[PDB]
């Protein structure tokens, strides 16, 4: 920009394909994006999310599949500080963060002032009525948020 006498030195340090692998939302999607959408399908499980993750990512040059664990369901990614094995069991539940709304509304109107202040915002509690049952996890939808503005 200032136009000094210089010649560019590559230092070889950019981590962006590792970041796109997790972050990317559209075009070839990332680990977070697939976890966001599989989350809203009634025949998805944490296992389907990993088999979909091989479909989008698979060959990618910062991705690697597990030591043949597709039962536990796990994958590996090559981060700047090393290769982590990630185990994807109960990640749709964590990305969703569901709660029983019937007990939650009891706290909203409680006879402790402190509990009532702590549970003052119930407007974004998300009901699903999801049947945690191994092999066949089943995801109904019982949504309940103001104006339909919920976020993964």
């Amino acid at each position: 920009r200032e136009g000094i006498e210089w010649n560019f030195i590559d230092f070889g340090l950019d981590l962006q394909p590792c970041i796109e692998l997790i972050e990317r939302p559209t075009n070839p999607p990332g680990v977070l994006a697939l976890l966001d959408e599989e989350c809203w399908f009634p025949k998805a499980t944490d296992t389907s999310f990993v088999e979909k993750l091989i479909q989008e990512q698979g060959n990618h040059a910062k991705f690697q599949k597990s030591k043949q664990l597709k039962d536990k369901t796990e994958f590996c990614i090559l981060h700047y500080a090393g290769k982590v094995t990630y185990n994807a069991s109960a990640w749709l539940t964590k990305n969703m963060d569901p709660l029983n709304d019937n007990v939650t509304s009891l706290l909203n109107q409680s006879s402790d002032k402190f509990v009532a202040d702590l549970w003052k915002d119930v407007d974004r509690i998300v009901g699903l009525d999801q049947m945690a049952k191994m092999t066949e996890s089943s995801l109904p939808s019982a949504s309940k948020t103001k104006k339909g503005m919920f976020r993964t």
Binding site: N102, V103, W119, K133
Partner: protein
């Protein structure tokens, strides 16, 4: 903090004749309800047999043992996360 711990002592036991679970003690729920300032029977009905609404309908159902454990587990971590966020805003209130 004590009620977040105390929710972990609530024990769902799978009942063979309906395939649901029921609450086979009153003390664990009684301690939790007193320290949440809420009612034992309305809590017990809400945890086992919630009266939810799906869009248009009213679905009054019974939850299984695995689901009742998950519901109490989720409520405990959520109330802990709410306390940390409250404490953080309470700290920011005086600093700035």
């Amino acid at each position: 903090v004590s009620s977040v711990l105390q929710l972990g002592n609530i024990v769902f036991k799978k009942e063979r004749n309906t395939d649901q679970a029921s609450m086979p003690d009153n003390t664990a729920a009684q301690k939790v309800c007193h320290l949440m300032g809420i009612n034992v029977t309305d809590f017990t009905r809400s945890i086992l047999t919630p009266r939810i609404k799906v869009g248009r309908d009213v679905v009054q159902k019974a939850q299984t043992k695995e689901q009742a454990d998950f519901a109490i587990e989720a409520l405990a971590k959520a109330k802990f996360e709410r306390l940390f966020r409250w404490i953080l805003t309470r700290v920011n209130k005086a600093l700035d």
